[PDB]
Amino acid sequence: DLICAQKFNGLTVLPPLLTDEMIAQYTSALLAGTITSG
Amino acid sequence: LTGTGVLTESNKKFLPFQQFGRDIADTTDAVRDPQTLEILDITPCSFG
Ligand SMILES: *[C@@H]1O[C@H](CO)[C@@H](O)[C@H](O)[C@H]1NC(C)=O
Numbered sequence: 120d121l122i123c124a125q126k127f128n129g130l131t132v133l134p135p136l137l138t139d140e141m142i143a144q145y146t147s148a149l150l151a152g153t154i155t156s157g
Numbered sequence: 158l159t160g161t162g163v164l165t166e167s168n169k170k171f172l173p174f175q176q177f178g179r180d181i182a183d184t185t186d187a188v189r190d191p192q193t194l195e196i197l198d199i200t201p202c203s204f205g
Contacts, residue, residue, distance in 0.1 A: 120181070121181045121182075124181050124182040125182070127182075127201060128182070131205075
């Protein structure tokens with residue numbers, strides 16, 4: 120669609136280094152460490 | 158009108174009077190063969 124259309128005129132989009140799974144893992148680690156150790 | 162791309166038969170329902178096609182970007186992405194009445198899709202060859 121429009122997002123794909125832009126791709127065809129020398130405009131490109133790169134993917135982020137960290138994926139949502141890794142972000143979620145970091146957040147869960149922080150939360151567990153907090154609630155178990157102040 | 159010239160260009161470059163890969164030609165594929167299109168299932169888009171052109172009306173009898175219409176002759177060309179255009180996209181959201183407003184560029185030629187569908188044409189009708191003159192000699193025979195067929196509608197084809199235009200997609201540029203891969204790049205990266
Ligand atoms: C010209 O090309 C079209 C499409 O094939 C055909 O219908 C028509 O009969 C042709 N006319 C002559 C004189 O060859």
